[PDB]
Every structure is written in C-alpha cells, then in structure tokens.
Amino acid sequence: MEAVQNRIVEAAERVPGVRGVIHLRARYVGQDIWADMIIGVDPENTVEQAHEICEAVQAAVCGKIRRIESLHVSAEAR
Amino acid sequence: GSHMEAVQNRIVEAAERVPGVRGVIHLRARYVGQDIWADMIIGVDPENTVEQAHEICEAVQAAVCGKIRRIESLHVSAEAR
C-alpha cells in the first residue's frame, strides 16, 4: 500500500497552505482506507486558519483518492 | 472506573490552570501496563498562532505530566474554542 500513501501525501502537499505531511497512518479495512494525517503549516497562521487548511486537505485528499472511507487531519508547525 | 475518573479530573484540573487554555475539549486516558497513555485536546483562543498554541500545549504537558506521575505518555493539541 505505498502508491496510495504516496498518492495521499502528494494530494496533501498540493493544497494551498500545506508546508508538508508530518505524519500519516493509513490502513485498509477491506478495500476502503481509513487514515489520520498530520500536516505541517506556517507557524504564523492562526488556529482558525490552520483548521481551514485541514478542512481543505481533507476535501481534496478524499476527493482525489476515492477509496478513502475516513480521513482525519490536524496541523502543526512546519 | 472511579480511580480513572479521579485521575482524569486531575488531568483536566492541571491543564485548566495553565494560562492560555479555554478548556479541555477532549480527554482519552487508558492504562498500558501500569502507566497512563493520554491524548488530549485543549480549547484555545482561535486567533493564537499555531506556534503559540503549541507553546500552550507544551506547557500543559509539563504541568499535567509533573503533577500526575502515573502518566508515561501525553500528547496535547489545541483547537479553537
């Protein structure tokens, strides 16, 4: 499952605001994926702003990788 | 159980008296052998920086982990409130 994580990470890295993927845990349950992602972000963004980035990553990542059934994202400094 | 309820009321109470914290939003704590692994989420001013939020978080960690020594691991994170 490493083209997929690669897919996910890349979908992540392209979203406006995302400084990098700090961490990903993705598992298959059947053929769906469930995953939890920690993105890196600009430390001078706000908590509000960082949350808006997390949302964006989620829509984008779940949109591009359709087999993901459930995805959580959080944000941290760079 | 009631001892874990006691320990949690203590985790909340330590974290809640760090300036910066607008509340405990969530707290999971469980024994892994004889120590606690907890993961918690603190409420913070939305207009705080990420860098700042992390400073509140790190400081909650220090307070909680120093007052409750049972705890071998604690991960703190901020969200708005």
Numbering used by the authors:
A (entry chain C): 214 to 291
B (entry chain A): 211 to 291
The paper states:
Each MamM monomer (residues 215–293) adopts the metallochaperone-like typical fold of CDF CTDs whilst the C-terminal tail (residues 294–318) is disordered and could not be traced in the electron density map. To validate that the disordered C-terminal tail have no effect on the domain fold, we determined the structures of a C-terminal truncation MamM-CTD mutant (residues 215–293) that adopted a similar CTD fold. As observed previously, the decreased number of particles per cell was at least partially a consequence of a substantial number of cells within the population that remained non-magnetic (10–20%). These previous studies also revealed that transcomplementation of a truncated C-terminal tail MamM mutant also allows the formation of wild-type-like particle. ITC measurements of the CTD single point mutants and the C-terminal truncation mutant revealed that the binding affinities remained in the same order of magnitude as the wild-type, with some alternation in the number of binding sites.
One group of metal ion efflux transporters that regulates metal ion homeostasis and can be found in all domains of life is the Cation Diffusion Facilitator (CDF) protein family. One of the most highly conserved and abundant integral MM proteins is the CDF transporter MamM. MamM was recently proposed to function as a magnetosome-directed iron transporter required for iron biomineralization since its deletion abolished magnetite biomineralization and mutation of residues within the conserved TMD metal-binding site resulted in alterations of magnetite crystal size, morphology and even mineral phase. To summarize our results we present an alternative model for the CDF CTD mode of action, in which we propose that upon metal cation binding, the CTD induces conformational changes towards a tighter and more compact fold which allows the activation of iron transport through the TMD.
